[PDB]
Amino acid sequence: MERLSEDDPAAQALEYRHDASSVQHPAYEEGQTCLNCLLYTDASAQDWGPCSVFPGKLVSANGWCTAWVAR
Numbered sequence: 926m927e928r929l930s931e932d933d934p935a936a937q938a939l940e941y942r943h944d945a946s947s948v949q950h951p952a953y954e955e956g957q958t959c960l961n962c963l964l965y966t967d968a969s970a971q972d973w974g975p976c977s978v979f980p981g982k983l984v985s986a987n988g989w990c991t992a993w994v995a996r
């Protein structure tokens with residue numbers, strides 16, 4: 926298990942960013958982050974945590990990707 930990289934192809938496919946504040950995408954809305962995403966398994970991981978859509982990786986709690994969905 927290791928931190929996901931923004932240039933990993935899997936990351937790119939979902940337009941993932943470690944910092945949501947840097948997202949420029951039509952579906953994005955300010956306030957959406959991995960931290961408040963249903964796929965972010967450990968709601969208490971405030972730094973790096975697992976994500977169902979990225980098996981074997983840790984994503985940034987302050988990040989975002991196109992698969993974002995409210996908890």
Ligand code: SF4
Nearest residue numbers: 959962964965976990
């Ligand atoms: S699916 Fe949710 S928790 Fe996983 S990277 Fe995308 S926004 Fe973050």
